[PDB]
Amino acid sequence: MMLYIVFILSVIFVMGFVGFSSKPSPIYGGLGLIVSGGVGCGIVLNFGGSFLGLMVFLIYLGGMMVVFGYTTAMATEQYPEIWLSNKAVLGAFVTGLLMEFFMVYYVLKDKEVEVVFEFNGLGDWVIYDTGDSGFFSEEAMGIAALYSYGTWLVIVTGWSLLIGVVVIMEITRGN
Amino acid sequence: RGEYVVAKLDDLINWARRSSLWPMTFGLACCAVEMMHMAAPRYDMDRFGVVFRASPRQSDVMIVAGTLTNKMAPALRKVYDQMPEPRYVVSMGSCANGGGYYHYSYSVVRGCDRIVPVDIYVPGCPPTAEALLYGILQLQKKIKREKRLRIWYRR
Amino acid sequence: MWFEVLPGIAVMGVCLFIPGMATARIHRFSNGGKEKRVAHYPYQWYLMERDRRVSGVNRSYVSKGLENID
Amino acid sequence: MFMINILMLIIPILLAVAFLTLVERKVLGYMQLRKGPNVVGPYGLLQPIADAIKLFIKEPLRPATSSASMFILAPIMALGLALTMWIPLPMPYPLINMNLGVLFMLAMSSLAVYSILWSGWASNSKYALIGALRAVAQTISYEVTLAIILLSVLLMSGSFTLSTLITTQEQMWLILPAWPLAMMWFISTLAETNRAPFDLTEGESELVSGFNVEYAAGPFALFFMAEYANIIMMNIFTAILFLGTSHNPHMPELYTINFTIKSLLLTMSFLWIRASYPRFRYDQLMHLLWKNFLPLTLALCMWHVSLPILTSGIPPQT
Amino acid sequence: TYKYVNLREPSMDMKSVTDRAAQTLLWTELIRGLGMTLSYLFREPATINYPFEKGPLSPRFRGEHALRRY
Amino acid sequence: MSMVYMNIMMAFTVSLVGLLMYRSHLMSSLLCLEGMMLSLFVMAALTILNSHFTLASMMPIILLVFAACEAALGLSLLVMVSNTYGTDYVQNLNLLQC
Amino acid sequence: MNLMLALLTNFTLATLLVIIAFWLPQLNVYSEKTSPYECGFDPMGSARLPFSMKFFLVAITFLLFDLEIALLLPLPWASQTANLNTMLTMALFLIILLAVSLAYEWTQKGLEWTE
Amino acid sequence: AERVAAFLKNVWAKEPVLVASFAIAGLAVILPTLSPYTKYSLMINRATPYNYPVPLRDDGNMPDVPSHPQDPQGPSLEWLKRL
Numbered sequence A: 001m002m003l004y005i006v007f008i009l010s011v012i013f014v015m016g017f018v019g020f021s022s023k024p025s026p027i028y029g030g031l032g033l034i035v036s037g038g039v040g041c042g043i044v045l046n047f048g049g050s051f052l053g054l055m056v057f058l059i060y061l062g063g064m065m066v067v068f069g070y071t072t073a074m075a076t077e078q079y080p081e082i083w084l085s086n087k088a089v090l091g092a093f094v095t096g097l098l099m100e101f102f103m104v105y106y107v108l109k110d111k112e113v114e115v116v117f118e119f120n121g122l123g124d125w126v127i128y129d130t131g132d133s134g135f136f137s138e139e140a141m142g143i144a145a146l147y148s149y150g151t152w153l154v155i156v157t158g159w160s161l162l163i164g165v166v167v168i169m170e171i172t173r174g175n
Numbered sequence B: 001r002g003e004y005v006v007a008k009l010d011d012l013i014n015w016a017r018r019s020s021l022w023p024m025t026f027g028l029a030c031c032a033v034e035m036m037h038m039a040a041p042r043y044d045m046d047r048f049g050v051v052f053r054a055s056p057r058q059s060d061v062m063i064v065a066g067t068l069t070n071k072m073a074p075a076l077r078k079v080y081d082q083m084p085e086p087r088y089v090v091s092m093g094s095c096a097n098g099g100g101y102y103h104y105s106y107s108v109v110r111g112c113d114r115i116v117p118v119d120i121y122v123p124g125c126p127p128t129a130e131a132l133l134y135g136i137l138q139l140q141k142k143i144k145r146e147k148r149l150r151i152w153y154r155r
Numbered sequence C: 001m002w003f004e005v006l007p008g009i010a011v012m013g014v015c016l017f018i019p020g021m022a023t024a025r026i027h028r029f030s031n032g033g034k035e036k037r038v039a040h041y042p043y044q045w046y047l048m049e050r051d052r053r054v055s056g057v058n059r060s061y062v063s064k065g066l067e068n069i070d
Numbered sequence D: 001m002f003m004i005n006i007l008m009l010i011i012p013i014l015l016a017v018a019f020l021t022l023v024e025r026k027v028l029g030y031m032q033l034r035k036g037p038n039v040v041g042p043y044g045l046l047q048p049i050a051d052a053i054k055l056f057i058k059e060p061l062r063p064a065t066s067s068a069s070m071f072i073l074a075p076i077m078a079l080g081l082a083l084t085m086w087i088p089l090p091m092p093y094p095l096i097n098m099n100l101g102v103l104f105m106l107a108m109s110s111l112a113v114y115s116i117l118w119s120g121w122a123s124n125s126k127y128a129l130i131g132a133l134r135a136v137a138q139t140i141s142y143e144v145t146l147a148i149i150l151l152s153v154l155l156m157s158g159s160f161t162l163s164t165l166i167t168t169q170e171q172m173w174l175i176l177p178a179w180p181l182a183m184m185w186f187i188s189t190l191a192e193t194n195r196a197p198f199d200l201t202e203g204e205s206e207l208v209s210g211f212n213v214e215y216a217a218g219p220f221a222l223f224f225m226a227e228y229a230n231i232i233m234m235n236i237f238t239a240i241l242f243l244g245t246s247h248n249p250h251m252p253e254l255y256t257i258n259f260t261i262k263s264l265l266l267t268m269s270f271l272w273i274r275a276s277y278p279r280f281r282y283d284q285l286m287h288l289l290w291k292n293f294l295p296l297t298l299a300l301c302m303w304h305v306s307l308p309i310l311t312s313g314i315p316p317q318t
Numbered sequence E: 001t002y003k004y005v006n007l008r009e010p011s012m013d014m015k016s017v018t019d020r021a022a023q024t025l026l027w028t029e030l031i032r033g034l035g036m037t038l039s040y041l042f043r044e045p046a047t048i049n050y051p052f053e054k055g056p057l058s059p060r061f062r063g064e065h066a067l068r069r070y
Numbered sequence F: 001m002s003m004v005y006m007n008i009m010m011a012f013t014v015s016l017v018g019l020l021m022y023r024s025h026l027m028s029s030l031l032c033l034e035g036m037m038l039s040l041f042v043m044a045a046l047t048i049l050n051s052h053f054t055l056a057s058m059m060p061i062i063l064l065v066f067a068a069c070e071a072a073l074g075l076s077l078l079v080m081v082s083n084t085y086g087t088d089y090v091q092n093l094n095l096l097q098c
Numbered sequence G: 001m002n003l004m005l006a007l008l009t010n011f012t013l014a015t016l017l018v019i020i021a022f023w024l025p026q027l028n029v030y031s032e033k034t035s036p037y038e039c040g041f042d043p044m045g046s047a048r049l050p051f052s053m054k055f056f057l058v059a060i061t062f063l064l065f066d067l068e069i070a071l072l073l074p075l076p077w078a079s080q081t082a083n084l085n086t087m088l089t090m091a092l093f094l095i096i097l098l099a100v101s102l103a104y105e106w107t108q109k110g111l112e113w114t115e
Numbered sequence H: 001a002e003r004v005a006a007f008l009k010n011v012w013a014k015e016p017v018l019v020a021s022f023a024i025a026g027l028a029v030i031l032p033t034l035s036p037y038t039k040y041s042l043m044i045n046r047a048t049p050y051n052y053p054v055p056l057r058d059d060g061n062m063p064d065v066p067s068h069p070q071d072p073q074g075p076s077l078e079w080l081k082r083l
């Protein structure tokens, strides 16, 4: 049912994580993180944040494109490993999906599960707000306050990105 | 009737293949200069649907334009092999036909037909740009008379 | 001559014209001859879901004027 | 009636792409003192139909050294994402009316890059690999400039909605107030579409065929279809951004005719350019956009943040 | 006798520097390249309609061999 | 604590366990750090968007800004490791003994 | 619903075209046909060998600048605030620091590809 | 004034893109501090009614608060209709 779209996207979100957490060739690990970024954008986008969902997808699409170039230069071998070529990779991949299956199986059967925290399986739609906003997007108004309210945040992040460029040149200088 | 249908389908695929011939960008010797003039404005092979493409995996025709030497022969067979079918070979010039001026050389293959199958032989040294274009239009007529589906229909 | 290039542009132009025309006409057909209601913000969506209830036929594009008040 | 709307979008798109190949070959032909296709059909009108059939009845091969799942996923991803970048385009009414349509197209254009990287890598060929890593360099070159060029224009429109760009240009095209930004935007769509003089991922005379050297038959056609659907789309985007068309709600067809003509002319300029200029070295493309466009784009971004404030011309949020 | 092909010193007066600045920023010499290919688009192509038309030859042309009679 | 929070919190645990169990490639571990940041971004965005905490809506963006700095910093170190040994294997990083 | 159905149709059409490509044509597969392409001669080594990136430093810098678009894209909404003096100050400060980063790398030969 | 003019001409001859960049950016920082219209941008943003204007309970001692929307009291947008 489409009422569980958020839950169905979060299952793919975990499956993508098991994709790169099992650590095959970073080429295939990068693909797994793109799938998680794509569905993660979908999950966030269904809670009312379209800018946040599209932005994280946009940032991670460029992030894994640099990682792809770095994988062909410094993280490549003759036979890049897939989720089936190695027992250690395959073992961790099957284990991740089985735990995902059991958690999904129990939450949809009992409507509850207790692991550190107590989770509810009624559906994500039961916690949404029943009132409408006005003529604006609340997420957009909060993000636009960074420049009027977040003067201190803009300075530290701005300085951090500046020093970030200085640092990477220093680290990679080699002399 | 089933024979009528396969006849019309055969006319359709035969038409599509002869109207969209893509020669491989492959020339060896002087004969490739005359092949350039067939792409030049006067003859404009592109207007017949004949477009060069460099990758053997996107080519339908190989034009062996020039001399084939023993050193190059393995390379020719490789690029011919890497052509998805259906694939046709056109042999252009005396060298590619039977060795030409260099028939009796220690280092020349006496005809490209010793290495690959050949569909059309274009004579000359070099054939004029208009003589190569005759061979291409003669190849198209050869494709127009194929009976792939009709032969399948009565197997 | 160069004007022999025009027939290929006319066919291409007709193909680019259809998507815009089809969407414009399909929207009219699906909203009772009006533009499809644009709801970019919750206030507009709130009014569209109120139109469904007022229409009495579960359609937001069925308008009810002063004939429905008395 | 929504499924009919989808089909009335993708099918005409695939037909326009088919005849853009004819139009490019004839326009390149006449700029080269020749004719181009005129035999297969009257004036070559059946040439695209002959090419489509030829490619899809030809043998496709999976190279012995290829990674099959990624080798076949790449062409599917390319065409699936080239058709997905048309759904928010107002012509004048979008199929999918998005509040952040400009962001959506940016996100999809960054995801469509991987149809090149995975295509080239999965082929397990040296020329496909060299082609794939040229797409990494190309994306690093234009991505920052492209996004900030859009931002500068949107500071005069006031929203990320594509349909709002129609209202912004109701009195005047944005080419006038933003001609410096329109120049850089146009060059960045050439780089983003891998078009000459920035056709480096393929680079015929250098890499034979680049990232798709190992592709044959139908799978190759999907990459070609995706390539040509993108250039039309990136020029429809340009016409909406800088050459706004008047929208009369009672004559929505007049918008489409006028908007279609501008898109055709911008698309013709892509073919006009491919016939006129040599090819950049892909390290010279990086320096073009980081040392020339980025310094200017950053300056113009500051200028367009301040200009609305100091003139009292900040656009409405909605 | 010889000539230099690329031994020239550009002018440094403010009007010449500005002219080169306009060329760099406004792509004047690239726009000029566009104008040359636009001219060809409106010229008659040099293509002949083979096989209905044939490229000119001469009586000295060396084609297929033949044995003659008296 | 809806059923979505379970999967998001499980994603973080998977990426954490993935980061703490190296195979060979330093690049494979860098992906797990970027995976963990993605989970935290999603989990924070969900909580903030659901509670209508308007001003907090910028926090997830500030979380991505400093995730890139770390990711860039990790890549810069990976360049120097590769330049010294020709690979990004972590078993070569053993000259220093505890 | 509409967006999801539009995506399913685009990738279903893309998939069906690929399926037809592999099942309609006549195939004749043999070893030499599917060997890797290297202009006619056998490749000398594996395509999976390391491929040096000469623009690695510029690629790292792309990660940092690509995060400025996330911080800069909210500007159209930021201009709607009543605190324009503060908003315009921090908008220009943020863009300027982005420019100083470019100037530093440019002057320190950071944008030049390694030999 | 002679040596400085040499610097400007030299950069204008070798980095015309950068000369335009710094000139454009300089105007972005300077003009807002000088334009008389900058104050109206603040007023227009403050005059846009996103929220509902919640009424004030009338205790009988609020002479500057209107009782009806069309009363003379309260802020006026006459300036905006002419700006």
Ligand SMILES: COC1=C(OC)C(=O)C(C/C=C(\C)CC/C=C(/C)CC/C=C(/C)CC/C=C(/C)CC/C=C(/C)CC/C=C(/C)CC/C=C(/C)CC/C=C(/C)CC/C=C(\C)CCC=C(C)C)=C(C)C1=O
Pocket (backbone or CB within 6 Å): B025, B026, B027, B028, B029, B030, B032, B033, B035, B036, B039, B046, B051, B052, B066, D014, D015, D017, D018, D021, D024, D025, D028, D048, D051, D052, D055, D220, D221, D222, D224, D225
């Ligand atoms: C002199 O010394 C020597 C050399 O030195 C030069 C040499 O070199 C050589 C070696 C020689 C050779 C290798 C051969 C040389 C021969 C030549 C002809 C080269 C000379 C110069 C040229 C300029 C020739 C042609 C090259 C170019 C660049 C011309 C440009 C025009 C073109 C038409 C090329 C392609 C252009 C376009 C616009 C695309 C057309 C491409 C297609 C594949 C067709 C369309 C594509 C499709 C996929 C089909 C469309 C429809 C689809 C996909 C379906 C859509 C619809 C649906 C319903 C689905 C030798 C021996 C030599 O001695």
Ligand SMILES: CCCCCCCCCCCCCCCCCC(=O)OC[C@H](COP(=O)(O)OCCN)OC(=O)CCCCCCCCCCCCCCCCC
Pocket (backbone or CB within 6 Å): E012, E013, E014, E015, E018, H005, H008, H009, H012, H019, H020, H023
């Ligand atoms: C007159 C046209 C007005 C309309 C133009 C509008 C476009 C403005 C952008 C283009 C720049 C032109 C404006 C600059 C002044 C030009 C007039 C001028 O400089 O005076 C002429 C005089 C004659 O030059 P001359 O003596 O032969 O040799 C130079 C020796 N210094 O030269 C001199 O000797 C005076 C000293 C010259 C050096 C001054 C510094 C010039 C370079 C600074 C950058 C100018 C561009 C800045 C704007 C960039 C954005 C476009």
Ligand SMILES: CCCCCCCCCCCCCCCCCC(=O)OC[C@H](COP(=O)(O)OCCN)OC(=O)CCCCCCCCCCCCCCCCC
Pocket (backbone or CB within 6 Å): G096, G099, G100, G103, G107, H022, H023, H024, H025, H026, H027, H029
């Ligand atoms: C109030 C807030 C606004 C102010 C913000 C404060 C920060 C301003 C700077 C932000 C932009 C960062 C870049 C600034 C440094 C400029 C770039 C640089 O470092 O140049 C160094 C340059 C190196 O080049 P080199 O190899 O030595 O060869 C040429 C030698 N002449 O060596 C050189 O020769 C350079 C010579 C000096 C260049 C001076 C550049 C000044 C730039 C600011 C001018 C702005 C005003 C101009 C516009 C006026 C208004 C129209």
Ligand code: SF4
Pocket (backbone or CB within 6 Å): B029, B030, B031, B065, B066, B067, B092, B093, B094, B095, B096, B100, B101, B124, B125, B126, B127
């Ligand atoms: S056949 Fe004649 S023109 Fe052709 S390669 Fe041989 S010698 Fe040269």
